[PDB]
């Protein structure tokens, strides 16, 4: 029942899935071998006749380094060997190479693996695709997989957690092209797209987690915390249980508006944790702070459409209502005029577990936030201004042309992003 | 049309404002200074800067600009020094902080092989004009202050300052340097066969290039119009005091400041 | 998205680098809306609230 299939695309997706599955195993008590010494796990883990607990995951990547490391890692006995799909050579930061040349020869067996995972599931809630449009296979192969899942699996929920490229720091120069081209699929064939750019997580870890040297490991641990906070509703019993459909229908006002920010609070270090009285109102305020989110996107530069709250721990609707009322009374953050309600709430009795050796301190109560707001146009405007400066005179376009797309796809993506900007601009308009 | 892209701005407007003000140049000249003398001082200052850059010597006009020649070292056949002189123009950090402009060239790049900078010789400027070095220094400070002032007062259309090296055209928060072909030709003639790099010539912000008939020559503005307009803008920028100021002669009346 | 439609009744989010090593986002303040109770409902309060 209530199963969910996880898919991890690209290096970013693979590492995020590593952290997420580490945290999930820690929560469910499933050892890396794949057995519990002494059935909420049924969402993410499947029983086997031999007593093993195989995760319902597909680690799909075009190059062998990351998947081979996962195979040789601690969870060798945990992960199903066929569920770890590895190609021979990567897309090399090319959406064309990941979408037209190399992506096609692996997508067929990727769908075969997805079918072999789905037929086992009976009450499949949907798909959780972790990827990054900055890369090539994360964008191209991810787009192909999303299209192939949409064309055959119907209206199943699809939560695409995407590590979008950052406003000013780049680990690649063609990631504007990659993200702009992949926004086609991430605008038509993803149910809910989640912004997860790295700089907001870096700032969170710098100022709140109190770490002078954060890395991808810490970033992925925080992403896994957010993922667990979102998906604990369909696993553990809670005061208010909400599903993937339950919150997508609340966070998607229009078919073209499904990009959402995440935040998690409290996200504090051990030293800072006992220095504060983390109440429901306090954690809600820390959530609604524009600084406390996992996207370099400013709500104060926009308007709110909808906000979904995942409370975990000893949280009570008693204080949930008070926190919501205080947030509404606050003036700096503005909700759009056509959505007076704007709030979605779900509470769970399970406090967030802490990974051993991690940097999060245990908190008796926590809350994650997934929000659709008009401010998304800020990050889209930044990223396609990057794209326009890039595409003014066609630099790094011969690669895409030679790797098997017509160059008019770049144009089509440009008008698609222009339409996304314009309706982001004009759906926040006052009636 | 007189709606932009045509109405070029001469230095005469800055000179008129400097003459019609309570500024440093007026204090130094005891009210005898004239916009004509300001124009003469600016023209000879441009000529002196042009001569300094001709002499392979970078020239810095205080709080306004630092025109420098980037030199590139190439060893010839017999290892004799062959020079590739690339003129480069960057505003003073004081001016950039003063009027919130940004330089296209970063400063360490500017000074990596910039020649040694020297102040423009105010004494020579005064000798050529016929006035005192103190008068020249006051006039140039007032002129550069009002040149920066123009934009913050009101900034879309061009303000083109003439320099011997070239013309600097001012936009809102942005500027554009056009090295004059005459100065470039003089550099090529006097370089001694070393080699001169033609600098990037951005598209002229005014039709006809920087050497275009400005508002004075076209007839858009006159001295009387500038006088009335500068009085009006001084009144507009002036602010009232909160409470009566006693003043002399027992006149508690307020006063714009 | 222009500031003079977006900030009709709220202060602009003055961007400031300190506190971040990357692009500044904003900081919320304590300003409250004027009392606008929905018409006719009883003065319903779940927990102690800051009085406007």
């Amino acid at each position: 029942m209530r199963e969910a299939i996880c898919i991890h695309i690209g290096q970013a997706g693979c590492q995020v899935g590593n952290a997420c599955w580490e945290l999930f195993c820690l929560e469910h008590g499933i050892q890396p071998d794949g057995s519990m010494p002494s059935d909420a796990f049924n969402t993410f883990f499947s029983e086997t006749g031999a007593g093993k607990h195989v995760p319902r995951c597909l680690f799909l990547d075009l190059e062998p380094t990351v998947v081979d490391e996962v195979r040789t890692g601690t969870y060798r006995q945990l992960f199903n060997p066929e569920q770890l799909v590895s190609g021979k050579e990567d897309a090399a930061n090319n959406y064309a190479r990941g979408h037209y040349t190399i992506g096609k020869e692996i997508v067929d067996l990727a769908l075969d693996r997805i079918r072999k995972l789905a037929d086992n599931c009976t009450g499949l809630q949907g798909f959780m695709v972790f990827h990054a449009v900055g890369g090539g296979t994360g964008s191209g192969l991810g787009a192909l997989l999303l299209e192939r899942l949409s064309v055959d699996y119907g209206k199943k929920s699809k939560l695409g957690y995407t590590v979008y490229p950052s406003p000013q720091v780049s680990t690649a120069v063609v990631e504007p092209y990659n993200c702009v081209l992949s926004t086609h699929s991430l605008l038509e064939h993803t149910d809910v797209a989640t912004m997860l750019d790295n700089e907001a997580i870096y700032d969170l870890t710098r100022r709140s987690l109190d770490i002078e040297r954060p890395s991808y490991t810490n970033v992925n641990r925080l992403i896994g915390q957010v993922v667990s906070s979102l998906t604990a509703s369909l696993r553990f019993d809670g005061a208010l249980n909400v599903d993937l459909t339950e919150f997508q229908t609340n966070l998607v006002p229009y078919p073209r508006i499904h990009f959402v920010l995440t935040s998690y609070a409290p996200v504090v270090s051990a030293e800072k944790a006992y220095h504060e009285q983390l109440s429901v109102a306090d954690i809600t305020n820390s959530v609604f702070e524009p600084a406390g989110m996992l996207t370099k996107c400013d709500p104060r530069h926009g308007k709110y459409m909808s906000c979904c709250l995942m409370y975990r721990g000893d949280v009570v609707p008693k204080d949930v209502n008070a926190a919501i009322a205080t947030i509404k009374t606050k003036r700096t953050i503005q909700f759009v005029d056509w959505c007076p309600t704007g709030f979605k709430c779900g509470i769970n009795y399970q406090p967030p577990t802490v990974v051993p050796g991690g940097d999060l301190a245990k908190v008796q109560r926590a809350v994650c936030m997934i929000a659709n707001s008009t401010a998304i146009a800020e990050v889209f405007a930044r990223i396609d201004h990057k794209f326009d400066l890039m595409y003014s005179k066609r630099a790094f376009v011969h690669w895409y042309v030679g790797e098997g797309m017509e160059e008019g796809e770049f144009s089509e993506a440009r008008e698609d992003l222009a339409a996304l900007e314009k309706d982001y601009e004009e759906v926040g308009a006052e009636s | 049309s007189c709606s932009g892209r045509v109405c070029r701005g001469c230095y005469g407007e800055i000179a008129e404002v400097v003459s019609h003000m309570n500024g440093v140049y007026m204090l130094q000249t005891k009210g005898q200074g004239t916009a004509h003398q300001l124009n003469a001082i600016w023209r000879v200052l441009g000529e002196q800067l042009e001569e300094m850059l001709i002499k392979k010597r970078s020239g810095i006009v205080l709080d306004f600009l630092h025109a420098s020649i980037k030199v590139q070292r190439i060893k010839r056949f017999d290892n004799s020094i062959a020079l590739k002189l690339k003129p480069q123009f960057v505003l003073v950090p004081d001016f950039t902080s003063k009027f919130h402009l940004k330089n296209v060239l970063e400063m360490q790049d500017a000074h990596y092989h910039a020649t040694v900078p020297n102040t423009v010789s105010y004494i020579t400027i005064a000798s050529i004009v016929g006035t005192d070095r103190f008068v020249v220094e006051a006039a140039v400070k007032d002129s550069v202050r009002e040149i920066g002032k123009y934009l913050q007062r009101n900034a879309a259309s061009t303000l083109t300052i003439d320099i011997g090296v070239g013309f600097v055209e001012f936009k809102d928060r942005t500027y554009r340097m056009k090295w004059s072909p005459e100065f470039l030709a003089r550099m090529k003639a006097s370089v001694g066969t070393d080699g001169v790099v033609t600098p990037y010539d951005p598209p002229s912000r005014t039709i006809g290039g920087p050497t275009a008939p400005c508002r004075f020559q076209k007839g858009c503005t006159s001295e009387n119009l500038l006088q009335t307009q500068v009085r009006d803008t001084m009144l507009a920028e002036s602010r009232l005091t909160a409470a009566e100021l006693n003043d002399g002669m027992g006149g508690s009346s307020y006063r714009r400041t | 998205f222009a500031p003079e439609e977006l900030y009709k009744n709220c202060p602009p989010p003055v961007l400031c680098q300190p506190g971040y090593d990357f692009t500044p986002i904003s900081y919320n303040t304590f300003l409250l809306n004027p009392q606008d109770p929905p018409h006719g409902v009883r003065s319903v309060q779940s927990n102690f609230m800051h009085s406007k």
């Binding site: 005029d337 006052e430 009636s431 | 709606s3 932009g4 701005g9 407007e13 404002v17 123009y150 934009l151 007062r153 009101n154 900034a155 879309a156 259309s157 303000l159 503005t221 119009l225 500038l226 307009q229 500068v230 009006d232 803008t233 | 003079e4 009709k8 009744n9």
Partner: peptide
């Protein structure tokens, strides 16, 4: 206490814009 309604019956958002600061093209 300032809640102005359109004749159709829609609440217009309040404004605190004093006026238009005419940032213009330069002239003295």
């Amino acid at each position: 206490v300032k809640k102005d309604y359109s004749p159709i019956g829609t609440l217009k958002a309040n404004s605190s814009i004093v006026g238009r600061r005419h940032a213009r093209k330069p002239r003295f």
